[PDB]
Amino acid sequence: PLILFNKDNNIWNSKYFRIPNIQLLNDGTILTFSDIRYNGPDNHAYIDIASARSTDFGKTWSYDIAMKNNRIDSTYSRVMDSTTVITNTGRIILIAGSWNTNGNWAMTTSTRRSDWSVQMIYSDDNGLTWSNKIDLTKDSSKVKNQPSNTIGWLGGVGSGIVMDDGTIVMPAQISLRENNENNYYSLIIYSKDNGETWTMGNKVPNSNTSENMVIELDGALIMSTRYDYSGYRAAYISHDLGSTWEIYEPLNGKVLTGKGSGCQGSFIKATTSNGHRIGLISAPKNTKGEYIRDNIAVYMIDFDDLSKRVQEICIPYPKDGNKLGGGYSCLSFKNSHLSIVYEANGNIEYQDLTPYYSLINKQ
């Protein structure tokens, strides 16, 4: 596997890389992102977000800094946990959480986190140049239906989707102040104006849910979310663009995540040659438990053949993750090509999983 972001050899001399992201462009361009964790693996540290671009199918990469933190705190200023999407116009949107203090983003403060904000950048030139950082939460002109008891929120860490009519849907996670407690939930946000303004959906029926991704299936939204301390990835379905949610049985609890806290994963849809709509999930098996997060595997479900059980297709990273921070992955499928980026002992590796999709396509 090619080392995309190397902790031992990078142009920023960063000691650690975390939270990968990948987008397969329509013309074959591969666009990837990752946290630039300069001082180490800690989440509450000095972090920017990088971009690696390839015009030769992953052989050579051009590196840049897509987003910088607010530059306020040389120790804690950070923009992190990227959530990306490609609109129908080709516009590439990146959504990230922004902080500059110490402490968990969801549990530290009992009121709205003062240094918290959601920053968004977009590129109209296929990832060559990026726009200015646009604050989505400093006022109320960009995001509608933001709960008043919001401690903070950010993207679902991964990739969004585009509906039939062109509506962009982004996975999201929110922390809410409810009855002297801080409960965090998963949900979605959507934009009908190419990402200029957004409307916030409602929370999923269960707390302790966070990082997630949604797919579109015949107008509905099917979510595969991180369900902490449940041992599995939860799944919900929505028929009103994320306003109401029901448990999606065919996927709920099917992907096990081992003991301890959950872990981020990716959930994308692919349409095989026989017309079937399949779901591809990447997540560590975590058979060794807790934050070890071993064996980043790729699972498959056939929505048009739901009697067939979820299949383990391959394990792109059949090793233990680093307990300091690992296990995150992101899949991207476009034009019968499948690619993955994942964390690998402080590094970010890349793989082309297209031959495995060809085994699925049965052509």
Residue numbers in the entry: 20 to 382
Show sentences the authors wrote:
We explored this hypothesis by determining the structure of NanHGH33 with bound Neu5,9Ac2 and an inactive D62N mutant in complex with a trisaccharide comprising N-acetyllactosamine terminating in α-2-6-linked Neu5,7,9Ac3 (referred to as SAc3LacNAc). Neither structure showed any significant perturbation of active site residues relative to either the unliganded or Neu5Ac complex. The 9-O-Ac group of both ligands project into a preformed pocket formed largely by N123, W124, and Y203. The 7-O-Ac group of SAc3LacNAc also projects up into a preexisting space in the active site. This reveals how these modifications are accommodated by the active site of NanHGH33, which is notable as they both involve the residues in the active site region of NanHGH33 that are not conserved in NanIGH33 and NanJGH33. In NanHGH33 loops on 3-blades forming the rim of one side of the cavity are extended, thus deepening the active site. The center blade of the three has a solvent exposed tyrosine residue, Y310, that projects into the active site. In the SAc3LacNAc Michaelis complex this tyrosine packs against the galactose to which the sialic acid is α-2,6-linked, providing additional interactions in a +1 subsite. In the case of the NanHGH33 SAc3LacNAc, however, the O4 of the galactose residue in the +1 subsite is oriented toward the aromatic ring of Y310, possibly making this less optimal interaction. Presumably, a similar interaction involving Y310 occurs when NanHGH33 binds α-2,3-linked sialoglycosides but in an as yet unknown but more favorable relative orientation of the galactose in the +1 subsite.
